[PDB]
Paper text:
We extracted capsid particles from the raw images and performed single particle reconstruction imposing icosahedral symmetry. The resolution of the reconstruction is 2.8 or 3.1 Å according to gold standard 0.143 or 0.5 Fourier Shell Correlation (FSC) criteria. The capsid exhibits T = 7 (laevo) symmetry, which is surprising for a capsid of this size. The larger size of the T = 7 capsid is due to much larger and flatter capsomers than found in other Caudoviruses. We observe conformational heterogeneity among the seven copies of MCP in the asymmetric unit that is restricted to the E-loop and N-arm. A series of lassos topologically tether subunits together to stabilize the capsid. In this manner, the E-loop acts as a lasso to topologically attach to the next subunit within the capsomer. Thus, the elbows form twofold flaps on the capsid exterior to stabilize the twofold and quasi-twofold axes, while the T-loop forms tongue-in-groove interactions on the capsid interior to stabilize the threefold and quasi-threefold axes. The decoration protein forms a unique cage to lock the mature capsid in place.
Capsids are protein shells that surround and protect the viral genome. Tailed bacteriophages, as well as herpesviruses, use Major Capsid Proteins of the conserved HK97 fold. MCP adopts the expected HK97 fold. The HK97 fold has two globular domains: the rectangular P-domain (peripheral domain; residues 107–186, and 326–373) and the triangle-shaped A-domain (axial domain; residues 192–320, and 384–391).
Numbering used by the authors:
A (entry chain N): 2 to 146
B (entry chain A): 53 to 103
C (entry chain F): 1 to 52
D (entry chain F): 104 to 409
E (entry chain A): 155 to 307
The structure:
């Protein structure tokens, strides 16, 4: 064994960003992030992904965002928007949450064990009580109202 | 094969491969008095190898 | 869509600067680089029915 | 009557990636978006040309623009069944050119078959064939036919039991085109151009055991028409324009500054002219001429995926 | 140098064992090069001749089958073949290649001629092989003597 054959080293995938309806409008506000949440596996992957965030309404962590526990009715009642194409969670701890946009259903997954580019059936099932409106395969949301 | 000389003791090879995204994906269908719809996301990728 | 890289600047960068082997000292070596571009040749455009 | 269709689309770039992306090897002072929008601008031009060729080929293949809701690039879920008036687009052929009934002999003489169509259209002048456009494996069907073979033997003097041992399939197929062209009188054009299927392998545009039959002329069959689209105003009056457009909306100065591109047009294909006596259109017809033609063809490389 | 060179050319594998001629020091090398599919499969060879007198495999068709199956594998179609001594004597007794020889000279056996002997019937077996496969043929009949047996190629 004195010759190594070719084996790959680098693996870079460069996707495009999550598309949204131009004519529906944008409204986004920066919120502080919860330190108890492991934000590494939420921003893990090259894939285009959105996910819902809730907010702590009171307590010692009030005003901090955390991803929405769909099995908790209190975290469903406190949803505030989506994080679109996640940022540098390591250098900064203040994420821009979009409160009003129009996103296709293929780009929103809650579970880490959920494939990308596919509709999350847990988000479609709770979309009445998540204040989501599914029209033409797109989520319509506005949390200013 | 002929013979060659190198004055070294090891030789290494590096290969860099690129794969662009194709301009595919027909067009979305419209009706005259309504608004448009957004276009899906594509993917490009690169690898590199060593012997 | 191409990945925003430099071709020449990345081949000169994915190689270890501080690597020693079972021999406790750096060894002499020689490196050749190669670049490939991968495209699907067999997905062609239906240019027939322009003339029709 | 005639009336067109409408199709357009859009794409937007938000505020993070406009000034937070450079290259991957070196460091760049935030101008790579100008490189990446310029590609994405050219890509939307390549969509409208791709949508036109889909509509155009859908007429040439069936004479039927059918758009179902559950369909690629129809998120809006629209129903369209646009029936043109192409009469009898499938030529009947209950046994192929490679049926091979019995021991080794086939059942259909194809040189007689196309000549039977020419004889049956002496007083139907819009209905005799002039040319055929085929995929790749047409000579391989002809060389193994036992009717066409007797035409190849006749023009050279090849009685098999005397005079010659029976030839190999090289010369027996190399002369198969010209004897088809001399004894049917029509033209043959080869369109071997390919595309890659989604799940499947590489496929041909004109499928493998199929061909098209052009009637009385080999000129243009139909027309693709662009209709009017609302451009901007010029002096308070609405100005219109036809063809594919590309509008740019720069919202680069508002509170979430963004940037958008919208492309589309209005149009539909139209057939040129029907028969004034009885309103029939027959300029192109499809013939499924054989079955096992892929066994005569080389394989294709699978798609390399990094 | 030639021994290592022929060891790659024959197997793609340099294998050095301790119990070996001219390895007194007892060393170990197994050097696997990246040669993919070094052996072409052929379960009935060319002189199987199953049945009465008819053989089974046409070499003119077999080496044309390989060129057809690599029209889009440009690094994989054959260009030339280098053979040992007795290649024409396999072709002349093949009953497929024979019909190629009869065709280019008009030798129908029932008329026109009695069937010839194997003189010209083998003398034209190279050119009819070279023209209908399109590839080059080089003959390398050079020999060596074994340690024990007779002279090998």
């Amino acid at each position: 064994d004195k010759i190594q054959l070719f084996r790959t080293i680098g693996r870079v995938q460069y996707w495009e960003r999550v598309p949204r309806l131009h004519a529906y409008g944008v409204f986004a506000l920066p919120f502080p992030m919860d330190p108890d949440v492991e934000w590494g596996n939420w921003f893990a992957g090259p894939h285009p992904k959105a996910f819902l965030v809730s907010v702590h309404p009171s307590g010692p962590k009030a005003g901090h965002v955390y991803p929405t526990d769909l099995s908790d009715p209190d975290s469903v009642a406190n949803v505030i928007g989506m994080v679109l194409d996640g940022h540098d969670y390591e250098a900064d701890h203040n994420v821009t949450v979009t409160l009003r946009a129009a996103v296709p259903i293929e780009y929103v997954q809650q579970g880490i064990e959920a494939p990308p580019l596919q509709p999350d059936p847990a988000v479609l099932n709770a979309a009445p009580q998540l204040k989501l409106k599914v029209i033409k395969g797109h989520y319509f949301f506005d949390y200013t109202r | 094969f002929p013979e060659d000389s190198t004055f070294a003791s090891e030789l290494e090879l590096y290969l860099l491969r690129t794969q662009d995204a194709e301009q595919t994906g027909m067009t979305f269908v419209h009706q005259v008095g309504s608004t448009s719809l957004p276009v899906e996301a594509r993917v490009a990728k690169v690898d590199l190898a060593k012997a | 869509m191409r990945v925003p890289i430099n071709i020449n600047n990345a081949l000169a960068r994915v190689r270890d600067p501080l690597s020693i082997g079972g021999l406790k000292f750096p060894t002499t070596k020689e490196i050749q680089e190669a670049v490939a571009a991968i495209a699907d040749k067999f997905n062609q455009e239906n240019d027939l029915v322009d003339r029709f | 009557t005639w009336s067109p269709l409408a199709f357009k689309e859009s794409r937007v770039w938000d505020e993070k990636e406009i000034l937070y992306l450079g290259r991957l090897a070196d460091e760049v002072q935030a101008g790579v978006i100008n490189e990446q929008i310029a590609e994405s601008l050219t890509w939307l031009m390549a969509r409208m040309r791709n949508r036109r060729r889909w509509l155009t080929w859908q007429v040439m293949r069936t004479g039927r623009i059918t758009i179902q809701p559950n369909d690629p690039y129809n998120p809006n879920g629209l129903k369209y069944v646009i029936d043109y008036g192409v009469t009898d687009i499938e030529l009947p052929l209950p046994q192929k050119f490679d049926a091979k009934d019995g021991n080794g002999n086939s059942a259909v003489d194809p040189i007689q078959y196309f000549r039977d169509l020419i004889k049956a259209a002496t007083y139907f002048p819009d209905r005799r064939p002039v040319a055929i456009i085929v995929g790749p494996g047409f000579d391989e069907v002809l060389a193994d036919n036992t009717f066409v073979q007797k035409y190849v033997e006749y023009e050279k003097g090849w009685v098999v039991g005397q005079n010659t041992v029976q030839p190999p399939r090289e010369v027996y197929r190399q002369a198969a085109l010209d004897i088809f062209k001399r004894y049917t009188g029509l033209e043959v054009m080869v369109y071997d151009k390919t595309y890659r299927d989604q799940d499947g392998s590489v496929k041909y545009w004109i499928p493998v055991g199929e061909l098209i039959v052009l009637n009385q002329s080999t000129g243009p069959v139909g027309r693709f028409v662009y209709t009017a689209h609302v451009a901007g105003q010029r002096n308070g009056k609405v100005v219109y324009a036809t063809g594919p457009y590309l509008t740019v909306k720069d919202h680069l100065q508002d509170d979430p500054p963004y940037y958008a591109i919208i492309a589309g047009f209005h149009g539909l294909p139209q057939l040129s002219g029907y028969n004034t006596e009885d309103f029939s259109f027959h300029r192109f017809k499809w013939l499924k001429y054989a079955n096992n033609v892929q066994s005569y063809l080389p394989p294709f490389p699978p798609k390399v995926e990094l």
